[PDB]
Amino acid sequence: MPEESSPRRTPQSIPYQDLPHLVNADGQYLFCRYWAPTGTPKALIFVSHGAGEHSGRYEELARMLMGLDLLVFAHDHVGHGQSEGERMVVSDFHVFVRDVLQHVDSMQKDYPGLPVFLLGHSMGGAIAILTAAERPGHFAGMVLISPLVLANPESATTFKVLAAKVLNSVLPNLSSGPIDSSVLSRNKTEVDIYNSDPLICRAGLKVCFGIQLLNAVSRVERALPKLTVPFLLLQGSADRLCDSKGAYLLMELAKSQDKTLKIYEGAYHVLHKELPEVTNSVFHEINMWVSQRTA
Ligand SMILES: O=C(c1ccco1)N1CCN([C@@H]2CC(=O)N(c3ccc(-c4ccc(F)cc4)cc3)C2)CC1
């Protein structure tokens, strides 16, 4: 008599059968999160995290959105957090977009008729832009916190010089330095918390993953003229990763009839984990923007 194989587990050894999950098109398990209101939801909102992090970093923002009677959902992208995959490896950037679409499609089946929004930060913001561009007219709105639109010219040059070797030769272990958290938030407590979270990937960016991030920038650039979804764009002027010029480029090139930009003077990259004055303002502005577009 044949027997079923040992239960499939997260990279942290927890059986997926004990957790909310989804199996993507490549047969990889993605860990899922849900924050649902007690009544009937007004809308659905997908939360898209960035490179090296995971959906658990959005707990407070998700609970604020749930308090507005929206059903919030998320997953850890492939190679991240509690999902499967070689850490910070992706065969092609589109895998991230494909997986977001599968989860959105799955959720719209269980809750039909509801409008669906996207919220993304950094690489997760590039994913949100590409997801909306793939389905024009389908999403009710998008909230972008420092999206990857234009990379910091210094970081782009470093990755274009490191790609030069990998694209022309076989160098599977080639990597750049790790994500420097101290220059991504002025809130030292938040930097310390990020540095203490075991689910964050602290290794240096592999050149093959940096190539997929440069692909994402190129794809976002082509997608901008086709974007029509309503969006709220939050950007810090002292962003060392996602150059503020990209936020201005997104306001200029998108065709969306409903687009708004809020610049946070002197703020660093991670606006939702910045100084309390900035983070409180970010939560308030997202609350107002989504409240005005839901009923
Ligand atoms: O919560 C925190 C935190 C709290 C306090 C301090 O930090 N986070 C740290 C930053 N991290 C970002 C997510 C993401 O996509 N990152 C990233 C973006 C572009 C790149 C990029 C690099 C080179 C390039 F050429 C293009 C893009 C690299 C990484 C980072 C979000 C989570």
Side-chain angles (χ1 to χ4, degrees), residues 18-236:
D18 300 346
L19 298 174
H21 63 267
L22 194 59
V23 183
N24 79 1
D26 293 317
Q28 294 168 307
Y29 279 71
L30 305 186
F31 164 80
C32 301
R33 297 195 188 259
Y34 303 94
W35 297 261
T38 54
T40 289
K42 294 183 189 156
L44 301 174
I45 183 160
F46 181 84
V47 171
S48 178
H49 75 80
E53 57 157 0
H54 65 97
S55 60
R57 300 288 292 148
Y58 293 84
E59 192 66 30
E60 290 318 307
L61 198 51
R63 294 185 174 273
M64 178 269 286
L65 292 171
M66 187 271 284
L68 300 179
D69 294 326
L70 276 90
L71 199 170
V72 192
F73 66 116
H75 60 242
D76 291 348
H77 305 299
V78 64
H80 289 77
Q82 305 182 69
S83 290
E84 285 183 326
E86 197 173 356
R87 311 290 81 185
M88 295 195 62
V89 170
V90 76
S91 60
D92 185 88
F93 202 77
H94 192 261
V95 165
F96 297 144
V97 176
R98 181 198 71 186
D99 290 359
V100 167
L101 292 167
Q102 182 194 345
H103 204 168
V104 165
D105 290 347
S106 188
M107 287 297 282
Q108 294 209 259
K109 277 252 305 313
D110 299 351
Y111 306 87
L114 297 183
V116 55
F117 290 76
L118 298 169
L119 181 144
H121 165 62
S122 197
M123 184 191 78
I127 293 166
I129 287 159
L130 299 173
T131 298
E134 190 145 317
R135 305 239 181 125
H138 175 113
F139 292 96
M142 172 177 66
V143 174
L144 297 172
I145 304 181
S146 318
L148 179 57
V149 174
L150 284 177
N152 165 256
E154 293 250 331
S155 302
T157 294
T158 291
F159 254 117
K160 286 163 197 176
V161 158
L162 250 53
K165 312 172 187 189
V166 166
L167 299 173
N168 294 266
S169 282
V170 188
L171 292 166
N173 301 317
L174 199 67
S175 321
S176 68
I179 290 166
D180 185 7
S181 64
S182 49
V183 306
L184 305 178
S185 178
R186 292 169 302 171
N187 186 324
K188 290 180 184 179
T189 304
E190 296 277 25
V191 172
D192 288 329
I193 288 170
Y194 173 84
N195 293 341
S196 307
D197 181 348
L199 292 179
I200 298 294
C201 180
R202 315 171 172 150
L205 250 64
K206 280 156 170 168
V207 179
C208 67
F209 193 80
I211 280 162
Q212 294 306 324
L213 290 178
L214 291 176
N215 280 349
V217 168
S218 289
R219 294 170 194 183
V220 160
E221 176 199 327
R222 289 190 296 269
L224 300 184
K226 320 163 178 180
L227 264 188
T228 59
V229 66
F231 68 86
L232 170 62
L233 174 59
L234 309 183
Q235 176 72 48

